[PDB]
Amino acid sequence: PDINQLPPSILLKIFSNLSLDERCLSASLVCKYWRDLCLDFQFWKQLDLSSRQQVTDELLEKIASRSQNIIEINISDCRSMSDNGVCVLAFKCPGLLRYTAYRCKQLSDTSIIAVASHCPLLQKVHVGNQDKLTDEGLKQLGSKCRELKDIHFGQCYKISDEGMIVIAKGCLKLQRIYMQENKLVTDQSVKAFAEHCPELQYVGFMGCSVTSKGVIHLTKLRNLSSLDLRHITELDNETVMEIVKRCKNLSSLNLCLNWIINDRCVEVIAKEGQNLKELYLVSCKITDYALIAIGRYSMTIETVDVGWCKEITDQGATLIAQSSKSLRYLGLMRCDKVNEVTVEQLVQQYPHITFSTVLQDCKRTLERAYQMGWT
Amino acid sequence: RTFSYTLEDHTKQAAGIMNELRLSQQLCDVTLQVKYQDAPAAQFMAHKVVLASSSPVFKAMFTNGLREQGMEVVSIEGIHPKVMERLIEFAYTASISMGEKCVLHVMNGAVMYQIDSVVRACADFLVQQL
Amino acid sequence: PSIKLQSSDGEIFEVDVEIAKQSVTIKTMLEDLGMDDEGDDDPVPLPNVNAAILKKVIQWCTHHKDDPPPNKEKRTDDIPVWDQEFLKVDQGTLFELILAANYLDIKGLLDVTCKTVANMIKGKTPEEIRKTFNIKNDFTEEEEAQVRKENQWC
């Protein structure tokens, strides 16, 4: 057996599957042949510069001037470099497909302007947090990167509806969109997104200033697979009923922190949800009737979570463990009216179901820790 | 002066060993980057289970539907890192302590994360400061 | 549909044409060679793959005959279970499978085997990698210091 007998193309392809740490701190120190192979810039392509103890700035411009053969750039964390490095990297990499840079709260909108201006083939853009992200820097991406597919703007409080509607007008291929705690973004953005981009599959407006009037417009998206509506302003039961009725491709529905979803709504969703696979109802003011309906009527739900639901009892879990054939994960987190000995009996006499309470998850973590025990 | 509040429940054994595990910096899957005005981007590491067992908002934020990569980074704003640290200490040890001038910030954080026990405690403390 | 291939050591394997179409090289030489009427189903010679490796590749392509191919996506640790169970072989067989997947142009098998080798590399110091792969350390203590000097930013 000899690895070096393989052609250099195969070895480069193998090294491409190694992280930057594992390649620079181990692979480059095996022998001079692997050193010369990993030193090559040709087959770098996707580069992950996440965190990196924030150790780069001028090196960003160095590697930008080095190679143009970059399709995905990950700049998560690492607050060291400024907008100039991002600008020159966008100048040097037009063939960029995926852009990722979470929690870079020092990057302004000049970076995203240069990005939109110097790489239109973008498909995935994840810019979580990062304050000073105005809509005027966002309409650049909305009008220039029409080939966009995935977009993430998590906790970017400096975004209103203008940039969102501009993004919705263009980028007809947008299959994913996620926004969290983004105020100033209301029903208008949701409506303009739902009626302009039928390619939408993943959508989420957690904590945004969205009401049922904007949520009901998602029925025009028969390709919706996952919907995230956690801690959202006043979502009546009828709206999500119509959502589950029309969007037949709905797989994951997230309704956490909605104090008005009742058990009749869960029953309607379980009945008319022929493709529903994951349902999250944390803090939803329901009762055991919701779980009983999920068990008796839905033959497709695998993951159901009723965490912090006050009125859930032992029977509500026992009946759904008996009557649900597709159930494999039960979210019984902080249901204080549930006895723990009952949950122990359930986990002992019900296989393929991972009952998740406080003590059960703590016990799983404690076993994973006792594998390397201490005291 | 200084106020404090201690609670005893069913997790008297699990919470302590989970706190020791947290102090060991071992098994962790949640990273909180707290930022507040001009305070540094404080970085805490913790388990999803302990944070979800004491606050429904943390549980809702941890049910994102896909946790393949294990470690998740959750940036938190509007709260001072010391307040968040005291909240995590209560979540892990069922006991919290604060200065007589930091009761309001602790109560704000607890109301933001719906921790009823320390909310009532801080309410009683703010009433007793009159 | 039926195609009869011959290995480099002299064994003949008759398989489905749609299964052999997973190999871009095989299907390309088939379209160029036997597009018109077949000459009594002449054997197709593969001089760079022996018998056992060809049999393993045929098994892998038979299990993976319904996979839908959509080229440049993110890297993960998917590697389906059956692929792992099939790749539970020695190093020689794995390297020969790599050589065949590069020769027969089987992108799925190439990806899975390269990911297996990269997982074998992952989480190991150079001293451990050299022992697990039989590679002599041609680095002097000077160059071994210079290389890690130039990569201090990790």
SS3 letters for chain C?
A: CCEEEECCCCCEEEECHHHHCCCHHHHHHHHHHCCCCCCCCCCEECCCCCHHHHHHHHHHHHHCCCCCCCCCCCCCCCCCHHHHHHCCCCHHHHHHHHHHHHHCCCHHHHHHHHHHHHHHHCCCCHHHHHHHHCCCCCCCCCHHHHHHHHCCCC
Which residue type sits at C14? E
Q: List all chains that touch chain B, counting a touch as 3 or more CB pairs closer than 8 Å.
A: A
Gyration radius of chain C over CA positions? 20
Residues whose CB is less than 8 angstroms from the CB of residue B86 and which lie 6 or more positions away in sequence, other chains included: B96, B97, B98, B106
* Same domain? A296 vs A182: no
Tell which residue, B34, B128, B123, has the closest CA to residue B84. Answer: B34
Residues of A in contact with C138 (CB under 8 A): 31-32
SS3 category, A339: coil
Pair B71, B48: CB distance under 8 Å? no
Do C95 and A21 count as a contact with CB atoms less than 8 A apart?
A: no
CA-based nearest residue to A202, from A150, A159, A238: A150
- CB-CB: which of C137, C144, C151 is closest to A25? C151
**Structural tokens at position B44:** 């805490």
Angle at alpha carbon of residue C20, lines to C15 and C25, rounded to 5°: 140
State the Cα angle at C152 between C147 and C153, rounded to 5°: 130
C-alpha pair distances (Å), C73 with each of A71, A115, C124, C137:
9, 20, 26, 34
What are C119's two structure tokens? 């997982």
Q: Which residues constitute the domain of residue B44?
A: 2-129
Examine residue A317 and state whether it is found in any structural domain, yes or no: yes
In angstroms, the CA B83 to CA B103 distance is: 9
Q: This structure's resolution (angstroms)? A: 3.2
As given in the structure block, the two tokens for residue B81 are: 């890192």
- ∠ CA A256-A262-A265 to the nearest 5 degrees? 95
Alpha carbons A300 and A244: distance in angstroms, whole number: 13
**Which of A27, A43, A59 is at the close of a domain?**
A43
Q: Are residues A167 and A259 in the same domain?
A: no
Between the CA of residue C63 and those of A351, C6, C11, C100, C108, what are the distances in Å? Answer: 29, 21, 22, 17, 12
Q: Do C148 and A25 touch (CB under 8 A)?
A: yes
Q: Report DSSP letters for A274-335, one per residue.
A: TT--EEE-TT----HHHHHHHHHH-SS--EEE-TT-TT--HHHHHHHHHH-SS--EEE-TT-
A157 in the same domain as A128: yes
Q: Which domain holds residue A9?
A: 1-43
Directed axis angle between helix A358-370 and helix A340-349, to 10°?
Answer: 60
Last residue of a domain, one of A164, A195, A226: A195
Which of A227, A188, A175, A224 lies closest to A205 in space, CA to CA?
A227
Query: Residue by residue, what is the 3-state secondary structure of chain B?
Result: CEEEEECCCHHHCHHHHHHHHHHCCCCCCEEEEECCCCCCCEEEEECHHHHHHHCHHHHHHHCCCCCCCCCEEEEECCCCHHHHHHHHHHHHHCEEEEECCCHHHHHHHHHHHCCHHHHHHHHHHHHHCC
The pair of structure tokens assigned to A176 is: 């994913």
The enclosing domain of A186 has a CATH number of 3.80.10.10
Report the CATH number that the domain containing residue A34 is assigned in CATH: 1.20.1280
Q: Please choose, from the candidates A263, A236, A257, the residue with its C-alpha nearest in 3D space to the C-alpha of residue A308.
A: A257
**Method by which the model was determined:** X-ray
Q: From CA A272, how far away is CA B129, in angstroms rounded?
A: 55
Residues A258 and A312 in one domain: yes
Q: Looking only at Cα atoms, what is the longest distance across chain B? A: 51
Is the separation of the CB atoms in A69 and A94 below 8 Å?
A: no
Contacts of residue A258, defined as CB under 8 A and 6 or more positions apart, other chains included, come to A229, A230, A231, A232, A235, A283, A284
Q: How many helices (H) and strands (E) does chain A have?
A: 16, 13
Taking a C-beta distance cutoff of 8 angstroms, is the pair C143, A32 a contact? Answer: yes
Q: Which residues are bridge partners to C12 per DSSP? A: C6
CB A89 within 8 A of CB A60: yes
Q: At what angle do helices C91-103 and A8-16 cross, to 10 degrees?
A: 110
A339 within a domain of the structure (yes/no): yes
Domain boundaries, position C47: 1-154
Q: How far apart are CA B62 and CA A290, in angstroms?
A: 22
CA distance to B114, C3, C23, C53, C76, per residue, from C20 (Å) = 61, 8, 6, 15, 28
Angstrom distance (rounded) from CA A218 to CA A200: 10
**Residue at A200 is within a domain:** no
CB pairs under 8 A between A and B: 90
- Cβ of residue A257 closer than 8 Å to a chain B Cβ: yes
Q: Name the H helices within chain A.
A: 8-16, 20-24, 32-39, 58-66, 83-92, 109-118, 138-144, 161-169, 187-194, 212-215, 237-246, 263-272, 288-297, 314-323, 340-349, 358-370
Overall residue count recorded for chain A in this entry: 375
Q: Which residues of chain B approach chain A closer than 8 Å at the C-beta? A: 10-11, 14, 17-18, 20-21, 24, 26-27, 33, 35, 41, 47, 49-50, 52-53, 56-57, 59-61, 63-65, 73, 75, 77
Query: Subunits with at least 3 CB pairs below 8 A relative to chain C?
Result: A
Q: Are B33 and B74 in contact (CB under 8 A)?
A: yes
Taking each helix axis as running N to C, give the angle between helix C91-103 and helix C51-63, from 0 to 180 degrees, rounded to the nearest 10: 70
Q: How far apart are CA C75 and CA A15, in angstroms?
A: 12
Kind of pairing, strands A252-254 and B42-46? unpaired
Helix (H, G, I), strand (E, B) or coil at A146: coil
What are the phi and psi torsion angles at B117 (to 5°)?
A: -60, -55
Break positions in chain C: residue before each gap, C to N over 2.5 angstroms = 70
Q: Are residues A16 and A157 in the same domain?
A: no
Residues A190 and A225 in one domain: no
Residue whose C-alpha is closest to residue A244's, from A214, A267, A260, A210: A267
Of residues A111, A9, A26, A108, the one with CA closest to residue A60? A111
Does residue A146 form part of some domain? yes
**CA–CA dist A212, A240 (Å, integer):** 9
In angstroms, the CA A165 to CA C64 distance is 44
Nearest to C53 by CA among C96, C92, C19, C86: C96
Sequence-distant (≥ 6) Cβ neighbours of residue A292 within 8 angstroms: A316, A319, A320, A323
Residue of A nearest to C116 (CA): A14
Query: Between chains, do A372 and B26 touch, taking CB under 8 Å as contact?
Result: yes
Closest CA to B73 of B105, B35, B17: B35
Q: Which residues pair with A304 in a beta bridge?
A: A279, A330
Q: Within a domain: residue A154?
A: yes
Q: What span, in angstroms and rounded, lies between the C-alpha atoms of C33 and C41?
A: 11
Residue A210 and residue A233 in contact, taking contact as beta carbons nearer than 8 Å = yes
CATH value at residue B30: 3.30.710.10
User: What is the number of domains present in chain A?
Assistant: 3
C-alpha B71: how far from its chain's center?
18
| CA–CA distance, C122 with C108 (Å, rounded to integer) | 21
Whole-number Å distance between alpha carbons of A43 and B24: 40
Facing residue for C114 by CB, picked from A13, A19, A30: A13
Q: How far is CA C11 from the centre of its chain?
A: 20
Q: How many domains does chain B have?
A: 1
Q: A217: which DSSP letter?
A: G
